[PDB]
């Protein structure tokens with residue numbers, strides 16, 4: 001019996017990425033979608049199936065919902081993940097899981113007490129391309145890793161740290177490992193709205209492998225990462241949001257020789273939704289997921305707290 005999913009909040013990311021995955025995935029059944037406006041729920045249910053539900057509490061009260069997807073704004077995650085878990089539902093929450101480390105630990109504690117899965121939906125982690133890149137690095141294609149950069153920036157349309165910078169920060173954790181420490185950062189705040197619109201952070205491992213992370217929403221739409229090694233460099237584009245049908249190309253340059261490798265296309269959105277569902281169905285809730293989300297939340301806090309904040313103009 002497929003896991004019965006309800007969605008709280010008719011989000012952009014839900015419409016574009018998560019719902020088409022849920023709809024297609026044999027293991028998950030979209031049973032209810034809730035909105036602040038019934039009319040919006042209904043538009044979304046006409047597209048993806050399910051019962052349209054007015055307001056979020058009524059969806060949490062349903063007996064045909066086993067798990068809830070939470071694509072709400074970052075600042076509203078904690079209240080609603082808390083209540084979904086307390087209603088006895090497993091929870092697929094969009095990144096960033098919540099807004100700080102202490103809050104993220106309380107959430108996991110609530111889920112833990114009840115045997116429930118709480119998963120942070122970094123769907124990019126479920127694309128095979130990063131492990132293929134990591135294998136090439138481990139084989140020595142560019143020698144020892146010296147430094148890392150990653151960027152995710154988009155055009156003007158949480159703030160740019162919580163909504164966008166979490167992606168390059170999470171990529172640095174994936175490739176550089178669990179001992180990353182904050183070194184310095186800048187956050188640019190628009191005086192007008194009081195909102196972070198861009199920034200750049202420097203982190204380091206204890207061996208001095210550095211990560212420079214750029215993010216923003218006042219930019220052209222870029223999403224890439226690059227490694228500098230002792231005998232070369234490796235970079236790739238479309239590293240956070242590759243289409244399901246898109247074939248990654250790994251670029252390497254070393255002295256007098258460059259190479260590009262085309263890798264298979266994969267649907268990371270479907271893969272993430274499927275991992276979530278397999279964990280719920282099997283009861284095997286990987287400890288690495290939650291520890292990684294906690295380490296993530298800490299570096300994000302360390303960035304917010306440590307950054308030089310610059311208000312313009």
Ligand SMILES: NC(=O)c1ccc[n+]([C@@H]2O[C@H](COP(=O)([O-])OP(=O)(O)OC[C@H]3O[C@@H](n4cnc5c(N)ncnc54)[C@H](OP(=O)(O)O)[C@@H]3O)[C@@H](O)[C@H]2O)c1
Nearest residue numbers: 009010011012013035036040071072073074094095096163
């Ligand atoms: N769109 C993306 O690709 C993208 C990119 C990076 C990060 N994210 C993350 O995904 C989550 C959702 O982002 P999103 O970009 O998809 O945002 P979005 O389109 O604004 O969707 C958020 C949804 O939450 C609901 N909501 C409840 N209270 C709200 C309020 N006071 N103001 C605005 N919306 C409210 C709305 O649903 P109802 O009106 O139906 O209740 C809205 O559709 C965030 O955690 C964000 O960091 C998304």
Ligand SMILES: [Cl-]
Nearest residue numbers: 121122123124
């Ligand atoms: Cl993602």
Ligand SMILES: [Cl-]
Nearest residue numbers: 236237249251
């Ligand atoms: Cl390319």
Ligand code: NA
Nearest residue numbers: 304305306307
């Ligand atoms: Na600060």
